[PDB]
Symmetry: C3
Subunit: 422 residues, 3 copies
């Protein structure tokens, strides 16, 4: 009956051939293969739900490509004559800058006692005004030369930015073997800072970032010494992550003002929100999230909260569980650096006359940098959903067909046959 | 009739079972699944024609492996006494070297006016002869020490090459922790060049490349300063690209003399052809493509053409559309550089007596380099044709079999049945 | 008969339809597709046995991650006053240290003749005791400052290790922008070594490695000069290899004491075994493999054997054939280094008073290092068995079903039908 009609292989022999050996043997093979189908399909479905993925890598030359943004800060942060009689500022800036650098601060120290006593008295003091006026600055005396792809550029092409290093200036703000070339005058005789707080090195610190991202110096910025010429070759490396089941991304999350999401952006936004809860003001190093806090509130309100946030781990990053998951698309600019003695014996005496300064000054103040695109200047890494629902529906077809030659229509036939029997 | 014979599932129920509920319901399921097959197969075929690809990465230690070729140039390009009374050469070389470095040249400048007036008069002048004789050279006084895998090597092991930096010498021309060790004497007192043209740094510039490729310094070469010891660890990174439909490669294109194709080689060959069209001679910095041009023709014929070629973008690179597509196989040598103070207080007085020169001279002239193979010194990235025609023919079989249990024979049966009906 | 029962498509037409055109044509299509099945399946099986693989890449931020171990050595290896009257030690250490550095040694040289004459006489001499007492040491006078994630650390946190550089000390032995910060005092006035043997540079040499691996300096260690501050950013890059058929790994091999396998560990264990065969003692630079050899046996027994081992290539590495195959899991710490002038003009006079030494001493002795984790501090590369037996059994099902709609049950039916005919 159903054996002659069903397309399930084997069963037709069971009824059609009634020989004892065949009538019994054929059913055994039917049972044997049928149980094999269930195991194989089970393995297939089990593997699918693990959410496997595979990656694709592309590397190419991009003749005309968008140069990134680069921000520069002086390793000496304050004007020498603006801090000679106002040494308290180093501890005040340390406390105030605790938002960006989370390095802890030791209470009862001599420095922290002087600053606290000062803040309680000089409540008018505006740290932002002081640091803006009495810090590093881009000027004809500070940026001796600069060129972008052979076109001269001026200090007016740099946008000012605040950072734990004080005033910082970013270039290119919002071809192989070509890029940005600069020449700085660190002017150690004019800019200084406290060495007792760990600021001993002299030079320029910079970070290369996308124009849409706020630079994050921390302990991550690159360095360049005085008296050497640094050649930096950068390559753009982009990576794409799948959503939570396949990757750690989470496109649902969006930052304030619906701005493009970035892991660093979430952390800054996350911290700013908490500080605005415990205290009614936000530090000026987190610009757009509200009002600026007074000097005193840094010691009383903002400082304890930052310790609490770190202590309770309220700003986790990374996994999708984290408050700041990995971004869907990550853009990175790996760099390799080589050095040459910048002032040559011929050039040393040429610059000495041109800049009207002694040769000793030149060797100790001038920093020369050169950031270029390599030849193979592009690379994309893609995470791919190895198998989709359409892809799985093919694999299950092969196994089911291979061992039994069945089909979804065959299953319906069996169910109908069982229903009649019931 | 055909229902009892066709293997297309479902239809057998339509005719065999004539019950109103079943006779109608079964056809509905047949129609439902049949339309599902077309959508799924359409998605499969649509995805196939996108030419997807997947990559494979292999990393391994190669005990005995072919060391690449390395070429060195002095950052000071001319002998001091050969150019003291012949300062015009700096602008002459700048104009002549415009083939390699495409940096533009400002007309009406004082330097360019003197050179042009000189060229109009000294038409006998042979720039190649001058630069070859009056430039950098490898000698016992310039290459103090050199060793390759523990075997001493001599200046005779270096092959001379012309470059925008003048005379350049390449080593190894056509094991972990071992490689090439060198010690140079830049001799700033003997080699100089114009700082007003942007040559201010002193040291050695070199590039690591395959022995079959002409070095391309441009703004891509690595640097090494005087008075420091540079340790460079290299790793060979090979990548393979599929043909145009799957990748950007194009194996059909081949260079002159059927030489191995390379993106840089195509650019040089492309430029040489155009210059030979507008002008009857080729610059000597493009060696094998014809005759050498006179000094005057550089100012009159070659220089304007290069601007035109860049202006019209006649030498695009990268995509398969480009005149110089990406090579099928790319070999790259990423490098990481570390530095130490080369002359120690003990060695400084040892070299002072050995070389019979003052300690000040040693600190400002000697350059020490060391290029080594890392432990994990190899890596291959392969682009693979994810699905071939054989691979696709399995996926289409699974979907067709799964939802209808049909086969290419089943389709022929339907066509024949329709033909009889027609 | 069998045509009406077999599920192999096409054959049913052969018997059922007896029209000359159809009776013959249908069999032709049956034959045509059947031969196509064999070719397609043959291609599938042939491709499977090549053992293809595909790779997956994951990159993420790890907020709290295990910092690696770092070991430091001084580029000057011996105390100046301990070797002034005992200059033979340089050649003795060169011979003894030949186990780690395999650089050959020239017999009949003046140095090797003095050392050999000394060894034959001073057979009591214990090289291990001398180097331990009369070498580099970590001390308050040598490690001026050190901090780990903001927590001060002391010389007692470093574990002593022997190396070709003499005494070496490893930190962290068995968060983004944070790590290890150090300040060394190379004290060139106290440590020296032979420049005639190729030790001319002064500074610090270090290698970053997993805590479970013995450091391998060789020509692979990183460098840091005196008078500059080096910022090292590291990222953990882990790779996994499949077994021999798919990759070069070989999990069966295990080291002595069933310790975790590592390519470098196998080489050290391999060499130690051979030396213990030809000679009855093992060098103390291979610690755990047996007894220490006498001073004389280094010249007589150990030295010739090492040449023989290298000459006969008894310690191959890499491929699964090699005596020391690639490890199943490889952990690597790529690093990028940037530099700044360490003593600023403000800090130079601050440290001069603090350390009670002249400014010239500071510039020539102090080394500052800083090893940090980057933001994207993790990465895993996985090699995957592209197709398993379950995966293959789907592809063979699609091809067989597509062209003939057959199944493993169909094949059995044919075999039984042929048996009856036979
Ligand atoms: C917040 C703050 O400092 N406010 C002061 C206020 O107390 C003082 O009376 C006034 C005149 O000097 O200047 C302002
Ligand atoms: C020197 C001075 O006061 N201002 C200069 C200005 O003269 C110059 O045109 C500009 C472009 O470099 O840079 C600024
Ligand atoms: C995080 C952020 O951008 N917040 C801004 C805020 O600073 C601004 O005052 C407001 C009005 O434009 O829009 C929003
Ligand atoms: C709130 C939250 O995400 N908690 C996570 C949980 O989802 C995850 O399963 C576990 C890892 O096993 O780590 C924790
Ligand atoms: C052109 C120029 O700037 N010349 C200066 C001069 O004005 C100054 O008096 C002297 C000493 O400082 O150095 C030089
Ligand atoms: C191309 C060129 O310069 N040719 C000159 C020629 O004009 C001159 O007559 C001859 C004798 O000096 O030397 C050569
Ligand atoms: C010094 C001189 O004039 N020529 C030397 C030669 O003596 C030496 O044999 C060779 C190998 O280094 O290098 C060159
Ligand atoms: C691009 C290239 O190599 N062209 C060469 C050419 O220089 C040479 O003169 C000719 C004869 O051998 O063969 C071809
Ligand atoms: C001549 C040529 O290749 N032109 C290309 C075209 O092939 C390509 O499709 C298009 C991108 O959409 O860019 C342009
Ligand atoms: C062996 C040697 O080269 N000695 C030289 C000597 O010839 C020379 O006169 C002196 C000053 O130039 O320097 C030293
Ligand atoms: C292996 C060795 O050196 N052994 C010596 C031995 O020969 C000597 O008699 C003894 C007394 O000095 O010291 C020990
Ligand atoms: C100076 C001396 O002899 N020993 C010092 C000890 O006093 C100090 O407590 C320790 C931690 O830095 O380092 C060591
Ligand atoms: C390679 C290695 O670790 N060998 C050790 C050996 O040094 C030690 O003496 C012995 C007893 O613990 O165990 C084993
Ligand atoms: C003992 C041993 O492994 N010998 C190998 C062999 O297995 C391998 O097939 C061949 C490469 O073709 O290289 C050799
Ligand atoms: C506090 C201190 O160490 N002072 C030293 C003093 O003892 C020494 O005599 C002098 C010259 O060496 O240098 C200073």
């Amino acid at each position: 009956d159903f054996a002659i009609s069903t397309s399930f292989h084997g069963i037709h022999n069971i009824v059609q051939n009634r020989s004892k050996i065949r009538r019994v043997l054929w059913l055994v093979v039917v049972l044997g293969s049928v149980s094999l189908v269930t195991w194989q399909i089970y393995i297939r479905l089990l593997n699918y739900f693990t959410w496997p993925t595979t990656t694709s890598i592309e590397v190419q030359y991009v003749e005309k490509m968008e140069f990134p943004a680069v921000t520069f800060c002086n390793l000496n942060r304050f004007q020498t004559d603006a801090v000679a009689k106002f040494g308290v500022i180093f501890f005040l800036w340390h406390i105030v800058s605790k938002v960006l650098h989370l390095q802890e601060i030791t209470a009862n120290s001599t420095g922290s006692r002087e600053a606290t006593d000062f803040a309680a008295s000089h409540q008018n003091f505006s740290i932002v005004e002081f640091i803006r006026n009495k810090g590093f600055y881009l000027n004809n005396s500070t940026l001796l030369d600069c060129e972008f792809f052979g076109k001269p550029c001026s200090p007016k092409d740099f946008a000012h930015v605040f950072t734990e290093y004080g005033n910082c200036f970013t270039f290119n703000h919002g071809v192989s073997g070509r890029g940005l070339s600069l020449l700085f005058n660190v002017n150690q005789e004019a800019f200084t800072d406290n060495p007792a707080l760990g600021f001993v090195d002299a030079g320029i610190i910079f970070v290369i970032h996308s124009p849409k991202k706020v630079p994050q110096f921390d302990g991550l910025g690159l360095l360049s010494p005085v008296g050497m010429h640094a050649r930096v070759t950068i390559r753009q490396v982009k990576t794409v992550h799948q959503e939570y089941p396949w990757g750690e991304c989470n496109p649902n999350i969006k930052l304030q003002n619906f701005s493009s999401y970035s892991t660093s952006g979430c952390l800054k936004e996350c911290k700013a929100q908490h500080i605005k809860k415990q205290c009614g003001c936000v530090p000026f190093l987190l610009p757009g999230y509200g009002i600026e806090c007074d000097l005193q509130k840094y010691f009383s309100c903002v400082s304890p909260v930052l310790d609490h946030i770190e202590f309770k781990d309220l700003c986790t990053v990374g996994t999708h569980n984290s408050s700041c998951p990995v971004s869907c698309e990550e853009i990175e600019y790996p760099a390799t650096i080589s050095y040459s003695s910048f002032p040559s014996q011929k050039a040393l005496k040429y610059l000495s006359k041109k800049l009207n300064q002694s040769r000793k000054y030149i060797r100790e103040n001038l920093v020369k940098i050169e950031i270029n695109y390599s030849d193979l200047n592009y690379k994309i890494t893609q995470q791919q959903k190895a198998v989709s629902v359409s892809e799985l529906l093919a694999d299950l077809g092969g196994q089911l067909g291979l061992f039994c030659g069945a089909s979804l229509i065959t299953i319906i036939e069996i169910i109908e046959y069982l229903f009649t029997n019931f």
